[PDB]
Amino acid sequence: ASVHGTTYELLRRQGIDTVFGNPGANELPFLKDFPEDFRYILALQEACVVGIADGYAQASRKPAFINLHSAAGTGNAMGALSNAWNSHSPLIVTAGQQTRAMIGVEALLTNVDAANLPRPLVKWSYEPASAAEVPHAMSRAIHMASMAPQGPVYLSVPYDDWDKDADPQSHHLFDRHVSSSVRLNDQDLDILVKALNSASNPAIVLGPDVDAANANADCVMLAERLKAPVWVAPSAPRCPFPTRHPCFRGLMPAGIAAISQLLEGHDVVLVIGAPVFRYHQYDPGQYLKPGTRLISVTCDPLEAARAPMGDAIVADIGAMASALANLVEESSRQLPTAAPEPAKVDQDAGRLHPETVFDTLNDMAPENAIYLNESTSTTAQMWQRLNMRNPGSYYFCAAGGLGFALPAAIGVQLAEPERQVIAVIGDGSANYSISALWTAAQYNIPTIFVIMNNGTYGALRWFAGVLEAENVPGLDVPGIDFRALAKGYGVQALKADNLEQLKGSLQEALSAKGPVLIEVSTVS
Amino acid sequence: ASVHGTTYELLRRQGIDTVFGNPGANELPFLKDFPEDFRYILALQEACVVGIADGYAQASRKPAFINLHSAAGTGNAMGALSNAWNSHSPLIVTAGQQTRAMIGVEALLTNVDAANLPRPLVKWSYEPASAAEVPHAMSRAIHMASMAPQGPVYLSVPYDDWDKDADPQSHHLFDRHVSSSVRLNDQDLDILVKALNSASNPAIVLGPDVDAANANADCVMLAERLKAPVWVAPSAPRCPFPTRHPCFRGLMPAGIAAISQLLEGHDVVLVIGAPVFRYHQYDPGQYLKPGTRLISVTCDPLEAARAPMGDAIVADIGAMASALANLVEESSRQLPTAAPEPAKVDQDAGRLHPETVFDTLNDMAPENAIYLNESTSTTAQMWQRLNMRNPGSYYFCAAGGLGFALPAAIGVQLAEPERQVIAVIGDGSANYSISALWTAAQYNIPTIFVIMNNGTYGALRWFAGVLEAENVPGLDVPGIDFRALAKGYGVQALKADNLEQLKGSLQEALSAKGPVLIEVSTVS
Amino acid sequence: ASVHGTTYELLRRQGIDTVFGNPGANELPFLKDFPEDFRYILALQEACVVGIADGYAQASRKPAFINLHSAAGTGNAMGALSNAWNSHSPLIVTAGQQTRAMIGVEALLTNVDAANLPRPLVKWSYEPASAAEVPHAMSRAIHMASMAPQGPVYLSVPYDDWDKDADPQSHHLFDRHVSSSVRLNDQDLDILVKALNSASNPAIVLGPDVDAANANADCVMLAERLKAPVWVAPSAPRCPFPTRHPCFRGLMPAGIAAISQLLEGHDVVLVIGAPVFRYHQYDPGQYLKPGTRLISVTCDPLEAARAPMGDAIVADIGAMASALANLVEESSRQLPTAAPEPAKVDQDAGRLHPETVFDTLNDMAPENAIYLNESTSTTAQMWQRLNMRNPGSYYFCAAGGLGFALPAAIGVQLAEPERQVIAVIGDGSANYSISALWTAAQYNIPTIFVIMNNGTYGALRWFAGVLEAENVPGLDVPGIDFRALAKGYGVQALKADNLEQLKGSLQEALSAKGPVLIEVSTVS
Ligand SMILES: Cc1ncc(Cn2c(C)c(CCOP(=O)(O)OP(=O)(O)O)sc2=O)c(N)n1
Ligand SMILES: Cc1ncc(Cn2c(C)c(CCOP(=O)(O)OP(=O)(O)O)sc2=O)c(N)n1
Ligand SMILES: Cc1ncc(Cn2c(C)c(CCOP(=O)(O)OP(=O)(O)O)sc2=O)c(N)n1
Ligand SMILES: [Ca+2]
Ligand SMILES: [Ca+2]
């Protein structure tokens, strides 16, 4: 067998059947003779390739496979890898290298010092020393991406390797099963359970690795047993809990002092599947108030090490959540009462308040919709206004890197064809990965894109005001016609200048057979 | 003085007056109080920011200053940095970092291990250890980008540094002059000149660093004195010689055997300002035929080290070209005779042959036009069909990384407001950095964009045929309306479906007061 | 031809005839069939291997070739590479890698991520992608080490590569000549010369790259023409000027304020072949006083970039020194007058003052002796008390890293068999690379080692007093018998407890046919 044939066999035996890519000359020897059981998903720029694969992996809860061109293609994707690192996304990033005979002279298309290029945004990065090593290196990539804490990996392959003879002993790679589905030993788990059972006023904080593990329902059981309020950790990349469950208390503010004040009075705070904590604004103060003890369960040693307070347990979130849910006592405390709905913002017959948009989406969208957020100034309101009952219902750029949601929404929709995806994207954010629209059109992936057009980088204007920073350039983005951009890439386009038009456009979009973009005129 | 005030003073004293950027929260404390003598050029995605700055630096022959957001913004620009490295572009890339008090906890927006992120695509990469070090680090960045061999550099700055007190002794940085304008010592230069004077059949090969140095006219003098044919080194990022001068022989093919056959019979081959050589295709054979000696003059130790043959001299290309032009004897050989014009391809009243497009551009464009090429399957024909008399007339992605020419053409046009820029971009290539169009519209930078629309990644279809590679996915890009994309970003748009319409559209474009995009229907 | 045969041919054609090494299993396929025209110099630990090669390269003014074992052997040498980086030493460091078939499984002896291991202490670091690339990679290593600014490089080679067939076209590598012997263009050089001719009170500061270039005599001519005092830049790794010439003013103190005060009143300060400046102690103040302009000539862009003041020229030091010496006017100012000899320290019949030791060495040693210094508390006195008329007469660990002088003195003595080498090494410093003594014994390299035994890390006790730092552990090193260590490794040993015994021991050492160690009891 050839390295080509052996590698595709390994991929299929390890559950991979889709290549997300943008091709180049070093990749043609890999992509030739493309197997009939595989699917290739083309995107027009590599940030879009990786974003689509990322959404697909996160929603599918399985690795996604990517093929990019050399250095320049890898480089175009490195902002997308920044988000993927922070979301623990299991991405297998391959890139083609020049033929081995031409690497030394640094022919055009040579990826110089290739394994260093994507660092520090990958768990493992490698170029094999020979063609017959390629299947083994691919095996390592698969497993490294997939083991807890999951994350992106990088493999560079000289193009001449594919046609070489493989080692027959590479067959031992095909069916390897590698597990990291581990939890705290019984004796120490019993100590933890006792501490939770003994707490007088526990709180729970959940992060994105809960949703990644599909631990949501176990966390519901845990919270009901402990009679405990539940917060989502700050800067949330995913939604780990039903947002209208009685215990839910919403998104934590991303500041040190704000979080310790919120937790004040809670004697035990159990954090599951989050960093401690993904703060954002500078908000100095106490990490915890006196009287509060924190215990973190994380899948990531790096998280456990850097937490400034609390104890930690490094384990698989699914296995831990299930064990805790099933082991804790049912408390005799009263169950928390559900938060009331938020205020209805007054809305005239002109430009839309973002709150109106979210309320209307929540009114009209199916109960199993999936939302993506890249409307950076409206996140707090979005989190209050969408009833998200089910797992896998929310994604937000995990490193704060714009250009995620537009492509990722396409990947999520591909992963979840029965669940309507609605991406809510600011007019600024929409440009970073605009060409991803084409993939939705060409593959008929029926994502709905809601562009919140206020003409400005609103979240930056807000931060500049918090800074009392004057005379800042570059904050306005006038003069973009998003209906014309959608037309450019083959996507049906609608405009909503007022609430009547928003409702009409959403009605049309929700019944369409293909992707749809709605440009919404929002308040400045 | 503050670090902010001291840093902007250093920048202005070192000739910097423009910031190419896409802002974020870590950069607002740098960008606030933006000096009135500086200009900010916004682009909507970081590949576009860096591409525009790159074109501006290359055309202006001076450093360009960039400000990007953290890790994600830097990451989005790394494909653009791949080209910048290969073109020796003097780019000062700054990125904002989290406040020092929040770096340890890895708050959102922290650039982890920041100095490693852009490697290996930068000459120098650094994060200062204190706020008062920032002006000095900026000084180092300026000089490192600007010294031969020029190239990109990276500086990460925690956002709290700007408001701190500067060291008063940073004033010594302001007026530092750093020169690398050096040439071979007289004794060894005399040996070289003797070897050139003694050659019976010399040839000259020129690369991009000639055009960067504005050494073109000295190279003309050299070639006329030596009575020598002149080739442009393969994979050419720039044009180093007048393309209708009698000595000009065109673009070398990017293959080992092809180049040694071309040089056969030339006893001395002098290469100036090029790698030896930027081969592309696999074309094995002899590096040089018996009888040919090669001498390379390069500004880059890395080039000199990796050449597989010949002697080398590492020196400034401007200083060396001038010294050689003025020192060599006038040979009594006959001057080379000019190449004839190429064939006129037969053209019906339907879709355009690329050759027709280039001939028409050459007919209609001003004699001081500047061309950019990202029409990857048509490069050889472009090189034969454009009469480029002047320096600075051609740019092509120096690493082969698509997404360069569209933004770079905007930067070149900003650098050279009297010279009409015409970017010839394939329909595939146009998507990588499509949002750069907006910057042309907003700043009214009157670049002309000629989109060669054949519906496919034509250069990849060609390579796949050379490979006899069948069943390759991802090679077709149907269904893009480039007039609608131009409308989306505010650029006047025209379509040319035949030669009559091409001429009419070019006539309109050449007289327009703003940027114009022409979508040309080219043969498949 | 094999890769083995081709590589040794390249080495010999490029002037390499000696391998400094400590062997291991991955290196046996390189070292087998060792050519009869090569010499292997074994040392017992890799810090010693590299130190010996470093001294040999620095004294010989040519590259030295090293072969180490994998990761562990490379790792043992990284402190030695720290010094080599700072001294611009042209060292070609090769290390053997596992066979390509075993690298993926990470068999014992695999050097993981090999090219990253010696960073940031090398100019270039690489592992070839195929066996036939090895000769080319070796070529690149040779040239990268040898081009200005010279420095160490690293090449990792899988052991199975050596027996493979080489590319016949590797013959083009054998006789490549690569020059970086460049100087400032005539127009700008004339500006510099005018500035020097016009100065009313010039000063010259010289660094180690002067001695490396053997530019010493040109600098003497320059100083005599300009009638200028001459200082050696701080933290001096080499001696660039005759220490009893009338212009010599000694070693500059390694502090910011101290140097600006020293230069006060000098209108133009010309620095040649030094960083600006290798300060050590914290001594805050002005970089330069008003009225002083600084101009630096450096072979290293990194030096030029980081200088906090002055103009800079990046060029070869030999070519620049010769051009300046020959171009400047003879000033009518009076020549500086020579410094008087230093004080004679009062010396009783007991333990030796270091000053006594240096005076006695200067009395007894040949005029062409070469000194190495690793007696860290006595450097200022050493610099005042040794008359060093000739180039190549002094070496000191250029990064301050102990373990250099003992092995380097062996390499220097091998490089300069007619010049008696005398290494003056503290009792603390002697231990770092003690096993290097064996190489002197086995090869009969007649270095004299003078161990200054005061029982303590004296320079650290001094710094702790400057800090008023009390209760510092680890500063005393009692209980070392250096005569017994010398016996252990086969070196003749003598003890000097007083001046009479010092003179007797030096008389014996200077007439010995082999290496000799003298343990001197020095004052505490
Ligand atoms: C790749 C990248 N570049 C720049 C930014 C900076 N950025 C920018 C540019 C923001 C404004 C986004 O504007 P929008 O129109 O999408 O939404 P709002 O108007 O609601 O803020 S929010 C912020 O973090 C970023 N995070 N990521
Ligand atoms: C960033 C990046 N991604 C992918 C490629 C691969 N690439 C691609 C995708 C080519 C086709 C470009 O198509 P085009 O329409 O712009 O021009 P032609 O049809 O004339 O080839 S040429 C080639 O090198 C690349 N070089 N750079
Ligand atoms: C490899 C290494 N380790 C530790 C040190 C620290 N070091 C030490 C340990 C010094 C004392 C050397 O003692 P000595 O006996 O050689 O000489 P003095 O007593 O004259 O200081 S000087 C100083 O920089 C160093 N520079 N290099
Ligand atoms: Ca409602
Ligand atoms: Ca699915």
Ligand SMILES: [Ca+2]
């Ligand atoms: Ca907005």
Ligand SMILES: [Ca+2]
């Ligand atoms: Ca014509």
Ligand SMILES: [Ca+2]
């Ligand atoms: Ca200009």
Ligand SMILES: [Ca+2]
């Ligand atoms: Ca095309």
Ligand SMILES: [Ca+2]
């Ligand atoms: Ca004396």
Ligand SMILES: [Ca+2]
């Ligand atoms: Ca010698």
Ligand SMILES: [Ca+2]
């Ligand atoms: Ca001592």
Ligand SMILES: [Mg+2]
């Ligand atoms: Mg990197």
